[PDB]
Symmetry: D2
Subunit: 257 residues, 4 copies
Amino acid sequence: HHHRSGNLTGKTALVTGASRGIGRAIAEKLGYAGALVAVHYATGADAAAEVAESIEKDGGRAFTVKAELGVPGDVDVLFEGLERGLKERTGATDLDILVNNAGVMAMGAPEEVTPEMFDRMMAVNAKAPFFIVQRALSVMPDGGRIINVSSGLTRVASPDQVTYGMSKGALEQIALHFSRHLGSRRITVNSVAPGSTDNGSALFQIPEVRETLSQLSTFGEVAEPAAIADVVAFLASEDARWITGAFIDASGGTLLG
Amino acid sequence: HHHRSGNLTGKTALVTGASRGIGRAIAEKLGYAGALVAVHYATGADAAAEVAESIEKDGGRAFTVKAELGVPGDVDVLFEGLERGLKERTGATDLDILVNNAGVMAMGAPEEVTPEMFDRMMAVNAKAPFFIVQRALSVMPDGGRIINVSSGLTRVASPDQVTYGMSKGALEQIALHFSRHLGSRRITVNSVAPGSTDNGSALFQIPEVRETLSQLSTFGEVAEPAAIADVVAFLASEDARWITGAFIDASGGTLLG
Amino acid sequence: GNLTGKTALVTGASRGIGRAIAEKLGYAGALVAVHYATGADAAAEVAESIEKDGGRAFTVKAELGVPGDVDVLFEGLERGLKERTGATDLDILVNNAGVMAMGAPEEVTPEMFDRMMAVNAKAPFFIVQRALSVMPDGGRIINVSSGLTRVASPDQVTYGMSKGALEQIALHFSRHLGSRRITVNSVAPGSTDNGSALFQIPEVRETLSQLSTFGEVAEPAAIADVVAFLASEDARWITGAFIDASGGTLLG
Amino acid sequence: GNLTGKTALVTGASRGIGRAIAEKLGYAGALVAVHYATGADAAAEVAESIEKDGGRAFTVKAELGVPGDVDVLFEGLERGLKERTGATDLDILVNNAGVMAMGAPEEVTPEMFDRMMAVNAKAPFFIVQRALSVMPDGGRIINVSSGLTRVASPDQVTYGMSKGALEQIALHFSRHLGSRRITVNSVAPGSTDNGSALFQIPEVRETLSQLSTFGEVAEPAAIADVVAFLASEDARWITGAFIDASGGTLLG
Ligand SMILES: NC(=O)c1ccc[n+]([C@@H]2O[C@H](COP(=O)([O-])OP(=O)(O)OC[C@H]3O[C@@H](n4cnc5c(N)ncnc54)[C@H](OP(=O)(O)O)[C@@H]3O)[C@@H](O)[C@H]2O)c1
Ligand SMILES: NC(=O)c1ccc[n+]([C@@H]2O[C@H](COP(=O)([O-])OP(=O)(O)OC[C@H]3O[C@@H](n4cnc5c(N)ncnc54)[C@H](OP(=O)(O)O)[C@@H]3O)[C@@H](O)[C@H]2O)c1
Ligand SMILES: NC(=O)c1ccc[n+]([C@@H]2O[C@H](COP(=O)([O-])OP(=O)(O)OC[C@H]3O[C@@H](n4cnc5c(N)ncnc54)[C@H](OP(=O)(O)O)[C@@H]3O)[C@@H](O)[C@H]2O)c1
Ligand SMILES: NC(=O)c1ccc[n+]([C@@H]2O[C@H](COP(=O)([O-])OP(=O)(O)OC[C@H]3O[C@@H](n4cnc5c(N)ncnc54)[C@H](OP(=O)(O)O)[C@@H]3O)[C@@H](O)[C@H]2O)c1
């Protein structure tokens, strides 16, 4: 197996929800840069394997980690798999880069939202990222990186996605408070807000929604996942060392009013 | 019983957590303005009665409603009591003004936050306000008002209150998304962000915290609850008809950097 | 009313939003200085309307954006306040006067830029500066901005720049003046019918109405009611703020 | 590097942050126009440093904030680009040049105000305007603002106003230029050691260091690395943004 070197050679990274979509693109980019990437998934193990194998065929290093998030024991399951894999491959449990990308999306009348729907959105999109950050701190060296994938919908009124917006609003608070907490350790903590992005899902196959999504960006297109990944990879690098506690707009001009 | 008239005469209002602190001040001000005020509480029934009686002795109309928020059946319990009281006193269940003020606060190391602590903060401060709004829409006439009491801590990094900050970040999203949803009904939906406010609690009796809280405002004082209530009462009035989807900074210059 | 015994200057009060603000502050009991550049008869009408409804008011001419402007304004203001009250004290300052323009960004000239900045940002700064010498503790400074500082509008970029500058006044002066308990805030109206012919053209009115989540352009009274609140003791704990009075124009 | 074949103008590149930006863009492969007002020898040093490390660069003199400034700048720039590349195409524009000042708000003069606005807001607007005629699709406009647009700083209110105006350029022009895929963004450095004597005074350096959550003032390279990212294809989906490169100065 040939080894491609890059700016993140020697670093380790966890990307949650890396089996497809934006997460996949993030893992691929971090892997290309030289980071040993833990490609996390809930149930898409074949997709996750494809990503990890892609990273390795291109000269990188990667492995998959299964953990359903939003249920009791989730963070323990995640970190058992992560730390086993990191120890096997590096001799240590150190985690340099954490990308909280896994999330769920939903569209529906606000009048129809149930308490169970609210709990699930909040459990996956806000609660799990908090507890993943909390657990990561015990193994993240000084100079680390935490990047939380939010949404432009925290700045664009979208009644049919209020629950989702609430969960991402909570997510964004992680960067604000933890950036200060972790300043002395030089761990940067930032939110990245993608605009509408073609994740290859069934919902993007629907003509009615797909038509309106393209016009949200000032560029008149939805994003390719790679356009979001390139921003995350920058934040994960030395070049973004003076950026912390920030909201980074990667929406292609969706937040212009 | 003598009747004092004001700008809100004929209107009805629910103020959650109106037994003490900011909520009490809000109820008193809305009552003085002529609104029939439902003074809500969880367990401080004697304090709630004192508030309602204060409102009535000053020429207004008020009654108390018990509901523990953040538990199954909470919104049903709340609205059973509210609607019974409104029907008894007005012949209708119409609710003109909704103030989501009830909330919990906590200070502690981020490393020590437990999942149970997170759930409770989110259940009371974000989830319950969402479901209260959802339920209120079925009884709120066009021209109504929804005011959510947030916190300046959504804009000031405060590691020992990250969980609280997350919950208020979620809360703030309610005004953004619902303002658009409800535009055609002319129901305004806004967030108000108090700065540190003397609520008469035990925590304000502690010298160490009380000293640092006073210096957060550019005025070098903590707020009196009445200073926050006067802002809420404005938002509840006709004079604030062109304000919706807004974050209203009632922090006495706490958010200046 | 709640401003009885207070004095106020409302710049650009001869018409539009400023006229509505003057009328509202006067009704609440403030002695209002009704400022104008060339609209002397319209200014006189506003002052008379305030008097007619039981208040006190007078007019003060000053063309803003030219050398000597703030001197002219404050000579007229302070003389008029001293004559009427026995003091030059100014409790409430509303920087409302402003100019608006639409055009392709490629056609903006340096002269157009200077004029916009001179009236919309520079004059408000020097008016605030001069007002500090005569504003008692518990005073109020309210700057009328625009929602266009938050909504990308290429045909109004120079106006946007000027209002972005104006908004910084509240940020920095709120901290400077905290110990005097003078609040300093920006109010951002949405599209508001100022009585100009522009707003009577159906196609233009329709387009502008759709900017608000309410599907209407504002009446000036809707903005004035917000300003009067900020000028009152009810807004004593609001300083350094951006107050969105746009009818939901800033929702994305 | 990732900017090979691209051309760039960095205003105020003779020293400080602009010098670091020029050096970084040149290392990435851009032909860099190193602009200055009076620092000709320092500008020459920067251009030589770029050449020495394998790149291409040249200097262009223009005093900004005076009549004819943009004409002088673009005559020099376009002639130099045409000579070196055969075209006047400008891919990357960095409005970095700016003036800073501290003093009591009561002592600010109209002349001080005009100078600050002329250099920090007006010249960037007219530079952008002129650049549109020679910027190809896929270009980049990056305006260097300041964290002080978000941190109340009474002794720097006029600077704050000027930077608040500057920030509006990205908002409005991002929408104007979307169909050309030219991104327009503001970068906000925190306190950054620009090599001036101010930063060698221990007491001042200590105070400024505490503004960042890292307890240090920035090296110019930390800011330049952010600008170089924005100038690259990696930032193609960032437009109309405020990018906080302040080391956690804006946390409250
Ligand atoms: N697409 C957009 O337009 C858009 C816009 C803005 C922001 N975002 C945000 O970007 C992130 C990625 O979005 P996307 O469109 O790439 O998502 P997507 O294609 O659905 O992919 C979701 C990823 O998250 C994982 N995941 C979902 N639920 C999980 C759970 N409960 N536990 C563990 N993993 C779970 C999935 O794993 P499996 O494969 O195992 O199911 C998958 O890898 C999300 O946070 C989303 O909110 C997306
Ligand atoms: N104090 C500050 O400095 C400050 C600053 C910014 C924002 N805020 C926000 O302002 C709001 C009021 O704060 P405060 O200081 O006035 O509060 P406080 O004095 O503790 O009063 C809390 C009120 O909420 C009620 N409540 C608490 N938990 C409840 C629950 N689970 N179910 C139903 N009611 C519950 C309490 O009812 P009982 O009397 O029955 O217990 C009480 O009426 C909160 O949303 C808080 O987050 C406060
Ligand atoms: N209308 C809107 O949709 C809208 C929306 C958002 C914000 N705004 C802001 O609200 C404020 C008032 O706008 P408006 O629509 O009411 O404007 P308007 O109807 O055009 O009235 C302009 C007022 O300002 C005065 N003025 C203009 N230039 C002046 C100068 N150089 N020196 C002294 N006074 C000058 C005018 O005095 P004369 O009568 O003597 O000419 C007049 O009283 C402005 O700052 C504007 O930017 C307006
Ligand atoms: N340093 C900080 O802490 C800091 C923090 C935040 C933002 N900023 C911003 O970052 C940018 C660069 O700041 P810096 O600290 O690197 O500044 P600096 O060390 O003072 O360098 C100023 C540069 O701008 C040029 N310049 C100044 N006035 C000019 C004019 N009227 N016409 C043409 N060029 C002019 C100078 O050219 P000459 O050499 O010919 O005089 C010089 O190259 C500025 O926009 C500043 O506002 C700085």
